[PDB]
Ligand binder design. Structure first.
Ligand SMILES: Cc1cc2nc3c(=O)[nH]c(=O)nc-3n(C[C@H](O)[C@H](O)[C@H](O)COP(=O)(O)OP(=O)(O)OC[C@H]3O[C@@H](n4cnc5c(N)ncnc54)[C@H](O)[C@@H]3O)c2cc1C
Ligand SMILES: Cc1cc2nc3c(=O)[nH]c(=O)nc-3n(C[C@H](O)[C@H](O)[C@H](O)COP(=O)(O)OP(=O)(O)OC[C@H]3O[C@@H](n4cnc5c(N)ncnc54)[C@H](O)[C@@H]3O)c2cc1C
Lengths: 196, 195
């Protein structure tokens, strides 16, 4: 005997042709909308630094983890890979227990040794690439979709026991900025997938 | 005319990874390739690097081999940092654009590379068993090692390069097999890197 607890991990970074403003904006849009909607929200700003232990506790507290990030060389910026390499690993015993296999039947069960089953996660990504690069079979990603491109990132999260919510993506963000459209679409996405 | 080979060793001592298998395989490749007549250069990512020198190394190389452990389903963060710095700073030399240099912006993404003709190869070490990649009911839904490494492949292909077949060692923690790893890797190099 409110709404779901949400942790937003903002992986914005000012570097070369990325200035981090779109990712900061979408982080704030989600935080404000979700809070308005009744969710408690915590925000981690990766590039600013973080306390590994606190982050592990944040995952345990969260019902849903949103990764807000730009696309850097087809995936997460290095700062976010460092964050999971530190946080997930140090989370051994609390976020996951094992690889889910037995030495007895070693070919089976990989990825079933998580401890945070029940929690969900969602990718919110920003790309210079057009949406068609992911869906047109003759284009760069051979039709595998955004979730095919992010398959290893998805699987790192699923190894802990989590399941994904549908991915949100903004495309052509450099050549054809559409902040108003991004915000409207994102609010709609959050209303459908994160609010319940 | 054996290919110039750049080996990028992304080993890192951290938590349960001691880096020894990746260092061993880096050496196995360097020695075998040198004996076979290739010029070889080695970048040890965790020990540090000069970005300009690395850009020059890619231009020098005919084939780039990434020797790396699997960390959270992919490359260690140090190697993602290496490409985020080197590939980006290499704009104008390693790649020119995203390939959309004419009116039709929904098309051509990834065709703006500059190092077409060069090849790259992944040499990876995993605790996961080989069946996790191939058995359709297992974790990776049968997409294979190259499906798991899709984004890393595509980062390299955006520069214009094409892959050689991937080499993988599996169950490296619970069931080490250094002798087998070495024999299999030499065979893989002979078939794919030697010409
Ligand atoms: C190293 C590196 C690698 C990359 N690799 C890839 C890749 O592999 N694939 C790919 O598709 N892209 C890639 N890019 C592009 C990258 O994805 C984009 O730069 C990033 O998504 C932009 O997000 P940002 O938060 O940095 O926004 P910013 O760069 O700050 O802003 C982007 C645009 O949105 C506008 N904007 C942002 N916020 C607001 C606001 N609140 N109001 C009005 N306008 C706003 C800005 O004015 C600007 O026009 C890469 C970039 C770098 C630096
Ligand atoms: C943060 C982190 C995340 C990880 N994520 C994943 C993952 O998502 N998926 C996955 O499958 N695995 C993962 N692992 C496991 C990781 O892939 C292995 O630890 C790595 O491949 C081992 O390679 P290494 O070079 O560090 O070897 P080491 O750890 O140094 O050695 C591995 C074994 O090989 C032996 N060995 C090495 N070289 C020799 C030699 N020359 N002679 C005799 N014996 C030798 C060692 O004694 C040891 O038994 C992760 C590990 C870490 C630390």
């Amino acid at each position: 005997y409110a709404m779901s607890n949400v942790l937003i991990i903002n992986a914005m970074k000012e570097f070369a042709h990325s200035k981090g403003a779109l990712n900061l904006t979408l982080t704030n849009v989600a935080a404000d909308f979700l809070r308005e909607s009744g969710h408690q929200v915590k925000i981690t700003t990766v590039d600013q630094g973080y306390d590994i232990e606190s982050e592990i506790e944040n995952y345990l507290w969260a019902d849903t983890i949103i990764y807000q990030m730009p696309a850097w060389w087809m995936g997460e910026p290095w700062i976010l890979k460092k964050y999971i390499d530190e946080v997930f690993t140090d989370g051994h015993g609390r976020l996951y227990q094992s690889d889910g296999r037995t030495r007895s039947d070693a070919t089976k069960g990989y990825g079933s040794g998580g401890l945070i089953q029940g929690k969900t996660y969602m990718l919110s990504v920003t790309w210079n690439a057009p949406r068609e690069a992911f869906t047109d079979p003759e284009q760069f990603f051979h039709g595998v979709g955004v979730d095919g491109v992010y398959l290893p990132f998805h699987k790192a999260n699923q190894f802990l026991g989590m399941k994904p919510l549908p991915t949100f993506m903004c495309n052509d963000v450099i050549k054809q900025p559409d902040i108003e459209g991004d915000i409207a679409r994102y609010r709609q996405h959050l209303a459908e997938n994160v609010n319940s």
